[PDB]
Amino acid sequence: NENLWLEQQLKQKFGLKDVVVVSGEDEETQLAMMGLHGAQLLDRLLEPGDIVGFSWGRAVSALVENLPQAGQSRQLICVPIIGGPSGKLESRYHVNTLTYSAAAKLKGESHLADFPALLDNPLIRNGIMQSQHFKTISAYWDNLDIALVGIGSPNWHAFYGGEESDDLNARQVAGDICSRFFDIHGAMVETNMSEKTLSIEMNKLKQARYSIGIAMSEEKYSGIIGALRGKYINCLVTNSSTAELLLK
Amino acid sequence: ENLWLEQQLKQKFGLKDVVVVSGNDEDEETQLAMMGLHGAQLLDRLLEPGDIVGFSWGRAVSALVENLPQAGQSRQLICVPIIGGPSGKLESRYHVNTLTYSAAAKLKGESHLADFPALLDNPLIRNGIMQSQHFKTISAYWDNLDIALVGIGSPAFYGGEESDDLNARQVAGDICSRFFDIHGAMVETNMSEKTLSIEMNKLKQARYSIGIAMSEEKYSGIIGALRGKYINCLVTNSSTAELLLK
């Protein structure tokens, strides 16, 4: 109803392909509802043979958990677009867990990543990038059709810790997607991590037919709006509260 | 079901526990599922509160995991991989992380997944990963493991050249991609310097190290595994138990 109008207004303001806006209430409830309607969006946007990429986290999890069980294959390929969280997320939100579950729901194939998302030593990080396994995953990223992505925003402390979060907070980092940081205007911004990361590059993400961000909250507003302005996503699954914030 | 065969294996090889299922002329996949089902009952019987439970990869361990009884109560169990990922060399279904996560759900425990590969291109990278906090955390569980579930490899996955080198080095089988001869002695290969998985010494310290395996070969990887004492329990079939004694 009003949600539909909020969806239309967002499409027009940010040049988006698709938008889902849910009402909600509680926090984790709203996320389940976003996950449900966002999963409905994904299922309609998918095309046979699509390479589908998944980031990690609660938000993407909500969508994957709500995916209808397909009765037939659309020759889909499911791949993670970031390495594993190295213990910093519980297994249920691990990028491989989500990728695997989505492949089962979608009756597709999955190719799981056996490298970490973050490596402290640049040397090791670089060496893994040269292995056949990484190149194989990366080559899927090169041809990504659809991405599902949460939007990070100042876990910010969890992932990056005080020391690195500082540089972020001082560098006016508004948010991140797959551990790729940007300002409120959408501009990329280098960090103590922009060298030690194993995840899809924003340039590649933008080449996807659909990059679907799923996120909510006035707290995450800067992250979400920055992603919109940078065009790192071209679809948005969110709630009415945030929607209105975005239209302000 | 097959109590004499089980006791014969226990006595010959010094095993704590053994399951021998009767494969009634039935095909391989079916026989494996049977092993999985009765092996799962054994694992569930052997668990103690707070056990750290280590899983290798592969479809034999998968058969067992797929057939774990769904626990109603937590036994504060912690499930972990005892080998890195296969780097796309196995279907996702049989990935060690997939198996670990699924085991934890059935056991109402917690899982800690491994975000490093089992086999690296070179020793530099594999040593660097070992210095990482994540690897240290996982390897700490290996150091105090209570129960392990492993398949046993025998003579594609390692490449024709490596395969040939294995054949030339008299390698009869592997556990967690650590290789041994037919008498169960360890053999070091061009891959040991590139491998990230539990050491056999750490596997031997576990209360139960459960091999699940079958073979059509008189001279199998399993007899090696037993002689080397890398496992102290075995889940297998009638035909293999008989071979192991014959």
Side-chain angles (χ1 to χ4, degrees), chain A residues 83-87 91-94 96-97 100 109-117 119 123-124 127-128 130-133, chain B residues 84-88 92-95 97-98 101 110-118 120-121 124-125 127-129 132 134:
Chain A
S86 291
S91 317
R92 88 133 105 177
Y93 304 129
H94 187 130
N96 286 333
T97 307
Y100 184 75
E109 273 204 303
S110 62
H111 302 283
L112 308 191
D114 296 336
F115 46 85
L119 275 163
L123 219 178
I124 312 316
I128 281 157
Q130 214 216 334
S131 49
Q132 185 58 49
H133 174 63
Chain B
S87 290
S92 305
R93 211 196 335 191
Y94 306 129
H95 196 299
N97 281 339
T98 301
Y101 183 73
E110 185 183 8
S111 59
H112 302 280
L113 308 179
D115 303 336
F116 49 86
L120 289 184
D121 294 330
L124 309 164
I125 300 171
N127 289 135
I129 295 180
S132 82
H134 171 66

Side-chain angles (χ1 to χ4, degrees), chain B residues 66-86:
Chain B
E66 306 169 36
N67 284 275
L68 289 163
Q70 174 64 61
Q73 260 65 228
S74 173
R75 280 166 282 189
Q76 301 70 51
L77 304 170
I78 298 169
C79 304
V80 300
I82 47 173
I83 182 156

Side-chain angles (χ1 to χ4, degrees), chain A residues 165-186:
Chain A
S165 172
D166 299 341
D167 287 338
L168 295 162
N169 301 326
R171 287 170 193 265
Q172 320 288 310
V173 173
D176 86 282
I177 291 172
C178 300
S179 293
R180 247 99 215 209
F181 304 90
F182 45 82
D183 307 336
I184 200 155
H185 306 294

Side-chain angles (χ1 to χ4, degrees), chain A residues 1-197:
Chain A
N1 199 339
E2 167 106 312
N3 290 336
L4 291 176
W5 178 81
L6 234 25
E7 279 160 8
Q8 182 198 61
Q9 297 291 299
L10 282 173
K11 272 162 143 300
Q12 288 189 217
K13 190 176 173 67
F14 304 98
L16 309 177
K17 236 72 78 65
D18 266 286
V19 179
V20 161
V21 170
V22 306
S23 296
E25 274 182 295
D26 205 295
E27 201 272 10
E28 196 189 349
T29 288
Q30 287 199 317
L31 197 53
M33 318 203 311
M34 282 163 51
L36 163 67
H37 303 287
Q40 300 174 334
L41 176 65
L42 174 57
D43 205 63
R44 170 167 49 82
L45 258 18
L46 281 165
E47 290 285 315
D50 269 357
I51 300 168
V52 188
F54 298 88
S55 183
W56 61 38
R58 216 86 28 129
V60 177
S61 177
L63 187 152
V64 169
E65 292 188 324
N66 276 102
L67 276 168
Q69 176 63 234
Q72 40 183 335
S73 185
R74 286 166 282 184
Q75 347 298 149
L76 302 177
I77 306 186
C78 300
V79 304
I81 52 176
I82 182 169
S86 291
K88 291 146 55 176
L89 252 30
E90 58 183 278
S91 317
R92 88 133 105 177
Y93 304 129
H94 187 130
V95 74
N96 286 333
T97 307
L98 305 186
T99 300
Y100 184 75
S101 290
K105 297 257 187 29
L106 291 172
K107 284 198 59 166
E109 273 204 303
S110 62
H111 302 283
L112 308 191
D114 296 336
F115 46 85
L118 305 182
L119 275 163
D120 277 319
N121 188 312
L123 219 178
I124 312 316
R125 180 259 198 183
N126 296 147
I128 281 157
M129 294 207 189
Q130 214 216 334
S131 49
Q132 185 58 49
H133 174 63
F134 178 93
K135 286 177 205 183
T136 297
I137 300 295
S138 189
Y140 283 118
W141 297 346
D142 288 341
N143 295 298
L144 202 73
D145 288 298
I146 300 203
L148 288 76
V149 123
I151 303 188
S153 201
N155 286 352
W156 205 253
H157 249 251
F159 285 119
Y160 316 123
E163 305 173 21
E164 302 294 29
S165 172
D166 299 341
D167 287 338
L168 295 162
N169 301 326
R171 287 170 193 265
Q172 320 288 310
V173 173
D176 86 282
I177 291 172
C178 300
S179 293
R180 247 99 215 209
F181 304 90
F182 45 82
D183 307 336
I184 200 155
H185 306 294
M188 302 300 299
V189 30
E190 318 153 356
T191 49
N192 288 19
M193 306 181 154
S194 310
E195 59 145 48
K196 53 174 71 303
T197 288

Side-chain angles (χ1 to χ4, degrees), chain B residues 24-44:
Chain B
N24 259 13
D25 304 36
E26 269 161 318
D27 66 32
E28 191 253 304
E29 283 283 13
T30 292
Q31 198 146 203
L32 191 65
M34 203 178 313
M35 279 157 57
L37 173 64
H38 294 103
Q41 288 156 357
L42 172 72
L43 167 64
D44 204 56

Side-chain angles (χ1 to χ4, degrees), chain B residues 53 176 180-181 231:
Chain B
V53 195
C176 294
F180 46 78
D181 65 26
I231 62 184

